[PDB]
Amino acid sequence: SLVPVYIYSPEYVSMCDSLAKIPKRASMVHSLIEAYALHKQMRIVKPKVASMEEMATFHTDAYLQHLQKVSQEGDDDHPDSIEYGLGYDCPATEGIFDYAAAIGGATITAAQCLIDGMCKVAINWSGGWHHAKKDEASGFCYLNDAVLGILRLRRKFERILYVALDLHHGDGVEDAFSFTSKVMTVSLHKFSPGFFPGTGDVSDVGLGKGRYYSVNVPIQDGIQDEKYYQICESVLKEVYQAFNPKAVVLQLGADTIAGDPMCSFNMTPVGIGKCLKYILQWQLATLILGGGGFNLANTARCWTYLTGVILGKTLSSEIPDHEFFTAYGPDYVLEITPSCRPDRNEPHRIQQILNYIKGNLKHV
């Protein structure tokens, strides 16, 4: 009941390994967690596959049927695919519908675990694909498992907070709940013209009855642990005080970590860990999700460290022997060292963004 649920099965991880943009990442992530024996301190729960009905609670039938169609053989040359956002970012690799349904079902399973009181924390490190819209794939996302998980949590919880610490704006989740006040979305992300997905300015606050229940923290290149936590803590403080969430869905994309090929933010898992800690302190039902992360070893280093944070365990600095040990050479340590490049975030711009958010939350 105080032991975290860990969504895992060998067959699930294998399916997640087949995602075109992150091959073998799921295995590496689970393998490192196992090498630190953290799984022995968690309740391993095998994920159910998301039914068509569960998927259609957010995704349109036309899009679902298309995804299912091209997924059968692997038709990544189907002419109608561009309408549904399939193509370069989201290729129609065969089985992708079933793979996406497994991840969708995995996040739903985690949510159900939280509803039933089995745990206060549930983890799906292979979820967090928060870009996908109701009728189109987007940003390596085919099904929006985060939205599916949130819709599941809505069975018990009347006020759900979504926090995305991914490098990219969680536009799909924000879109899904743009018009409602039951769910508040909070996204910290890089915001710069031409940078995916191009949305999520501090002025974007949702629409209609959902106005001011969308929160965006636009951030520039090169932010590091200290400044990032200061921003995050001060935003989450106001949000908690104003929104009074009953449940939290936390997306922890590792594409902000130094050494990611995207080379934008300059974070270490320790900085993200402090953000996670601040949220965990609320002692609310918390769904933990992964996301982006394209330095695979570093992404495993990050989420392994974060699992330790969840368990309150200090981990050994040395990477333990396991299947992918050689991927962590030549230093073989868990810690990540930041790059020596500039922080483009002026403190005055940061402060104004902050105060602008403070003002918006007053209406809440």
Partner: peptide
Amino acid sequence: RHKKX
């Protein structure tokens, strides 16, 4: 529409 990626 943007490219990610």
